[PDB]
Amino acid sequence: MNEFYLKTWSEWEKNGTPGEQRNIAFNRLKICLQNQEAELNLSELDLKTLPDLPPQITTLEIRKNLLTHLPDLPPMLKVIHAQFNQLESLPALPETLEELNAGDNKIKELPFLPENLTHLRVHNNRLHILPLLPPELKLLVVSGNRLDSIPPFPDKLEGLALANNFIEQLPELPFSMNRAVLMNNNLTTLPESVLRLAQNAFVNVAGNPLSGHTMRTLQQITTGPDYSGPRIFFS
Amino acid sequence: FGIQPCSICLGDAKDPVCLPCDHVHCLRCLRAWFASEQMICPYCLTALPDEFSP
Numbered sequence: 001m002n003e004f005y006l007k008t009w010s011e012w013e014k015n016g017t018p019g020e021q022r023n024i025a026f027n028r029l030k031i032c033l034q035n036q037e038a039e040l041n042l043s044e045l046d047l048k049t050l051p052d053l054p055p056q057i058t059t060l061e062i063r064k065n066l067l068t069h070l071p072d073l074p075p076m077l078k079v080i081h082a083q084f085n086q087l088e089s090l091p092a093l094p095e096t097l098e099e100l101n102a103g104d105n106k107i108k109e110l111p112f113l114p115e116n117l118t119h120l121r122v123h124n125n126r127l128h129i130l131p132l133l134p135p136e137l138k139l140l141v142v143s144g145n146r147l148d149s150i151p152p153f154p155d156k157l158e159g160l161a162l163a164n165n166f167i168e169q170l171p172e173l174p175f176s177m178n179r180a181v182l183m184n185n186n187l188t189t190l191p192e193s194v195l196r197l198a199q200n201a202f203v204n205v206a207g208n209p210l211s212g213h214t215m216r217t218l219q220q221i222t223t224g225p226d227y228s229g230p231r232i233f234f235s
Numbered sequence: 236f237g238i239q240p241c242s243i244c245l246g247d248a249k250d251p252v253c254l255p256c257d258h259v260h261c262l263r264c265l266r267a268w269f270a271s272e273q274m275i276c277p278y279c280l281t282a283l284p285d286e287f288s289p
């Protein structure tokens with residue numbers, strides 16, 4: 001609708017390599033802006049770049065493309081699905097963002113995580129460190145990265161997945177946690193708070209070099225007659 | 236059809252199963268997780284449909 005966005009998009013449409021489905025994307029961009037739709041879906045279009053995005057969208061669906069960077073993210077966005085690209089970084093994240101999935105990319109470092117974020121999935125990236133975790137986070141997935149440590153967990157976090165990293169020490173776990181996927185890290189002990197999770201919580205610590213003293217401590221408590229902590233899988 | 240490593244165990248899965256989130260794991264390993272009623276992808280914690288069977 002806006003003439004300035006149309007000119008930018010028509011030039012972008014003409015500037016793609018033969019595999020990219022830019023004509024479909026160009027038509028979707030126009031219709032998104034014209035009808036002020038909440039979602040823009042450019043997923044599975046073999047795209048190598050994106051142009052300026054329609055500023056009113058609240059959901060950005062761009063999974064399964066060939067993107068290496070993203071343009072500026074519009075300031076109403078609440079959900080971004082950018083998994084299965086070739087991303088090396090993310091731009092600054094909108095304050096409105098609640099759900100981000102950027103798994104299966106090549107990201108080495110993340111930007112600041114905004115205050116309202118509830119779901120973060122960045123499995124299968126190249127992360128060597130994580131930013132601090134915001135207060136309302138409920139789900140954190142960082143499996144398959146290069147992490148040596150993980151920052152303190154906020155007190156509403158319910159799901160954690162960090163399998164296949166290099167983490168040596170696990171911070172104390174909040175009672176809100178009901179699922180901890182911890183396999184194949186470098187842990188030699190577990191924080192005592194793991195034994196205080198709800199009886200129906202699930203913890204898997206297989207593949208960590210847990211010490212003899214840790215194993216004797218865990219065997220004593222989890223096999224005691226009055227144990228009401230989580231089920232802990234060692235294999 | 237080449238070698239497909241388990242997301243967790245890097246072991247060529249004997250019977251690779253591709254979940255809807257495009258993550259592959261060994262059939263046995265999945266059955267073991269599902270035996271505890273954890274109907275999710277263990278790698279990205281995306282929930283699976285009800286009564287899901289690999």
Ligand SMILES: [Zn+2]
Pocket residue numbers: 241242243244246248260261262264
């Ligand atoms: Zn497996």
Ligand SMILES: [Zn+2]
Pocket residue numbers: 254256257258276277278279280281
């Ligand atoms: Zn998955």
